[PDB]
């Protein structure tokens, strides 16, 4: 009976993809999504808040000056590392959602999941256009998993911010946002801007949300 075909598969896949499980640890959080464990920490978050102040705390002076649209912008707000993880996961899905045929239901199913991760803070997503729940399969879940792993490795291939021409950030457009992920000495700065990146208008900065994903979270995937 493990061999003959069934509804059980779509059910398990639905459960893994439409739930973002979070468990508190001393260090931060354990997260479980798509059958993948992530260890998220809140180290580094205090420094982020520090940099939002004018406390001159030198040596980080450079970092704040590299990201004035984040640290010197009354319209930018700090989110938690859990949000940072959600944004990176949405970005990974998008970065391999973009090349899909307008099938569309599978691309639609991915878009729904990506959208839920990116723009909400809930632990559960109710997909009920179930012409896409039947787009849910173990094949689709495997594809999502391998491509999340591929995206995480792309991030690990980034160099820390530099003046040596070496790539240090990735930008991903979504339907209603621009996602930017930049490797810094603090870890990965994850930001969410408008599609026009108005936060970058140094004379009159638009809105942004940002946070930090500590290097340790990606190290497990190497």
**Does the footprint of its own copies cover residue 220 (CB under 8 A)?**
no
Binding flag, residue 126, its own copies (CB under 8 A): no
Name which position in 40, 141, 180, 212 contacts its own copies (CB under 8 A). 141
Near its own copies by CB under 8 A: residue from 53, 122, 185, 201: 122
Q: What are phi and psi of 50, to 5 degrees?
A: -55, -45
What distance in Å separates the CA atoms of residue 73 and residue 75, rounded to the nearest whole number? Answer: 5
How many CB atoms sit inside 10 A of residue 161's CB? 18
68: alpha, beta or left? (left if phi > 0; alpha if psi -120 to 50):
alpha
Binding mask 44-73 for its own copies (x = CB under 8 A): ------------------------------
Q: Is 3 in the site for its own copies (CB under 8 A)?
A: yes
Integer-rounded Cα radius of gyration of the chain: 19
**3-state DSSP: the chain helix, strand, coil percent, rounded to 5?**
40, 20, 40
Binding of residue 21 to its own copies (CB under 8 A) = yes
26 binds its own copies (CB under 8 A): no
- Sheet containing strand 76-78, edge to edge, reads 76-78, 208-213, 187-193, 178-184, 169-173
Of 5-13, 62-70, 160-168, 179-187: span binding its own copies (CB under 8 A): 5-13
Asked if residue 22 binds its own copies (CB under 8 A), the reply is yes
Q: And the tokens for 88? A: 């990176």
Q: Looking at beta carbons only, is 14 or 200 nearer to its own copies? A: 14
Residues that bind its own copies (CB under 8 A): 1-4, 6, 8-9, 11-12, 15-16, 19-24, 30, 32, 35-37, 82, 121-124, 137-139, 141-142, 145
């Amino acid at each position: 009976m493990i061999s003959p075909k069934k509804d059980l598969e779509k059910g398990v896949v639905l459960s893994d993809l439409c739930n973002f499980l979070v468990s508190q640890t001393i260090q931060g959080w354990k997260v479980y999504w798509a059958g993948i464990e992530f260890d998220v920490t809140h180290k580094g978050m205090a420094l982020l808040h520090r940099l939002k102040t004018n406390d001159f705390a030198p040596a980080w002076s450079m970092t704040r000056n590299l990201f004035p649209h984040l640290f010197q912008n009354p319209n930018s707000t700090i989110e938690s590392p859990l949000w940072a993880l959600r944004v990176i996961l949405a970005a990974g899905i998008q970065d391999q959602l973009i090349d899909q045929s307008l099938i569309e239901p599978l691309a639609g199913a991915l878009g729904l999941i990506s959208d839920w991760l990116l723009t909400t803070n809930t632990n559960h997503f109710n997909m009920r256009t179930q012409r896409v729940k039947e787009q849910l399969s173990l094949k689709m879940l495997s594809l999502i998993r391998s491509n999340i792993l591929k995206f995480i490795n792309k991030l690990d291939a980034l160099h820390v911010v530099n003046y040596n021409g070496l790539l240090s950030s990735i930008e991903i457009g979504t339907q209603n946002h621009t996602i930017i992920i930049t490797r810094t000495n603090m870890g990965f700065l994850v930001e969410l801007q408008e599609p026009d990146k108005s936060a970058m208008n140094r004379m009159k900065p638009g809105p942004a949300k940002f946070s930090l994903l500590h290097e340790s979270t990606l190290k497990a995937f190497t």
